[PDB]
């Protein structure tokens, strides 16, 4: 188990760690998060008490370095940094742990929720969507736009998700206009899976990362990408059986974790009704359909 210590907490803030969250008071003796499970990526995220504008946060993997958080009073935010002095790091953490100044990552033993949400998400792929090569961790916030959003404006601060556009020359072979528009299998299997992602695991990783950024930061372009990657599969007549079964599991745990009160803004009625009730794959997502109908029947 690994640790993300905090130098201090000078401003009141709600702190998230993966799907958990807690409140820290202004100048409270908080010095970080311990017992973080090794083997998964993680995200540590923030919403200031005095200004809920800009949710922001950091994706990281404790296997890739020793990371800590320190508040910057000039830029007005909690910043992740890497400590290269290993013995300094351990010495600081030990003082903080001995004085019980850290919260414990509160994982129930029965609970696979975080694994189920991040099964295909790897740090190396995150760092290609979020480009800041000098850091081993990745900053994301609520207002960051996507490359596709910027084509329709600072490129250094953008989310480089794979562009999906159903009415584009990439999606439609000349001479196969009706076929390719009504059955997106070409676009899914040849263009996206064989060509760009190389395999379904990378595709699902980006889909899962998009969802998590929509949920944890309210990032709109991430929500658009999540829905586009679902619709591309559901609108394809020919999808490998293992992908359909895995997608049903992926979406089930996403819909299970979504805050009930954020559904009006995180779920696109058109896409979900099309995917569950009209698409080629309308009968292939049994678990997702059942949780959607029992949890959000109004959307449908």
């Amino acid at each position: 188990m690994n640790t993300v210590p905090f130098t201090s907490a000078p401003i009141e803030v709600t702190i998230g760690i993966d799907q958990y969250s807690f409140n820290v008071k202004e100048n409270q003796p908080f010095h970080g998060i311990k017992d973080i499970p090794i083997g998964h990526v993680h995200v540590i995220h923030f919403q200031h008490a005095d200004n809920s504008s800009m949710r922001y946060g950091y994706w990281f993997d404790c296997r890739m370095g020793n990371f800590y958080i320190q508040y910057d009073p000039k830029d007005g935010l909690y910043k992740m940094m890497e400590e290269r002095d290993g013995a300094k790091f351990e010495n600081i953490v030990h003082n903080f742990k001995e004085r019980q100044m850290m919260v414990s990552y509160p994982k129930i033993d029965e609970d696979d929720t975080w694994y189920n949400l991040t099964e295909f998400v790897q740090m190396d792929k995150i760092r290609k969507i979020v480009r800041k090569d000098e850091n081993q961790f990745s900053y994301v916030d609520s207002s960051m736009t996507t490359v596709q959003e910027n084509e329709l404006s600072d490129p250094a601060h953008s989310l480089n998700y794979t562009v999906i556009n159903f009415k584009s020359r990439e999606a439609i072979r000349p001479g196969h206009e009706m076929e390719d528009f009504l059955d997106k299998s070409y676009y899914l299997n040849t263009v996206m899976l064989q060509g760009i992602f190389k395999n379904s695991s990378n595709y699902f990783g980006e889909l899962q990362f998009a969802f998590l950024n929509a949920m944890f930061f309210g990032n709109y372009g991430s929500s658009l990408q999540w829905h586009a990657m679902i619709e591309l599969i559901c609108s394809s007549a020919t999808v490998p059986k293992h992908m359909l079964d895995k997608l049903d599991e992926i979406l089930y745990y996403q819909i299970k974790t979504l805050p009930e009160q954020y559904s009006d803004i995180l779920l696109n009625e058109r896409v979900w009704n099309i995917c569950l009730y009209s698409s080629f794959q309308k009968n292939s997502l049994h678990n997702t359909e059942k949780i959607m109908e029992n949890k959000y029947p109004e959307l449908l």
Binding site: K167, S168, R169, I172, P174, E177, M178, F181
Partner: protein, 237 residues
């Protein structure tokens, strides 16, 4: 975006544009079978592609063989229309290609957009005008060429005959829409209004009779009366 009565004069400016109406592409008769079921029989159709400024009509005749062994024909017809309009645009010299294509039915937007991806600067637009272009097959010479076709064929017409020698394209389009609306509402009565006087004839190279300016005023008034008469019969007014 959409095209309506606020921006109506835009149809007659100097930016090349085409209306596309797909109503008559897939045409069927419905009949009983020997076993008492119901079956369709397709008949020849046409795409109505019109330049409202010049009167040039590109009538692509859709022969029933294009439907042979195909499924979901009402859906296919929209994509066949878009395929043929795209092929027409590609066949025209650059300086004759339209800057806008206006579809009379919104279901044509996505098929035409997809077939025209290679032409990102041609705008594909709907319209809020309810245009009576379905009644094109009530123009005898258009119906005759479509029904006699034994293979796919494109035929070119000027749907304004020689009117633009004497009137503007705004007035010519208004006359055409009034005539087509009347033919749509009561075809026999409209055909009788158009052909009752035997001394006024249709030139070999025209679609409509050779009315003088004053006679066109009379005909237009008779057509408006027909439409109002039919509205009164319909709604009991």
């Amino acid at each position: 975006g959409a095209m309506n009565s606020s921006n109506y004069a835009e149809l007659f400016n100097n930016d090349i544009k085409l209306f596309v109406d797909d109503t008559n592409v897939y045409r069927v008769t419905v009949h009983k079978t020997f076993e008492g079921n119901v079956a369709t029989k397709a008949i020849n159709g046409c795409i109505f592609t019109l330049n409202p400024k010049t009167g040039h009509l590109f009538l692509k005749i859709i022969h029933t063989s294009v439907w042979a062994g195909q499924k979901r024909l009402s859906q296919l017809a929209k994509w066949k229309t878009a395929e043929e309009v795209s092929a027409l645009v590609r066949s025209l010299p650059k300086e004759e290609q339209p800057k806008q294509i206006i579809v009379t039915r919104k279901a044509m937007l996505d098929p035409l957009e997809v077939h025209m991806l290679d032409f990102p600067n041609i705008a594909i637009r709907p319209t809020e005008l309810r245009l009576p272009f379905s009644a094109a097959m009530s123009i005898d010479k258009l119906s005759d060429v479509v029904m006699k076709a034994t293979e796919p064929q494109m035929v070119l017409f000027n749907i304004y005959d020689d009117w633009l020698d004497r009137i503007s394209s705004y007035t010519a389009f208004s006359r055409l829409t009034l005539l087509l609306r009347a033919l749509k509402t009561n075809e026999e009565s409209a055909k009788m209004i158009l052909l009752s006087d035997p001394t006024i004839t249709i030139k070999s190279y025209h679609l409509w009779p050779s009315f003088t300016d004053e006679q066109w005023i009379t005909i237009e008034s008779q057509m408006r009366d027909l439409i109002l008469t039919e509205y009164g019969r319909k709604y009991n007014v």
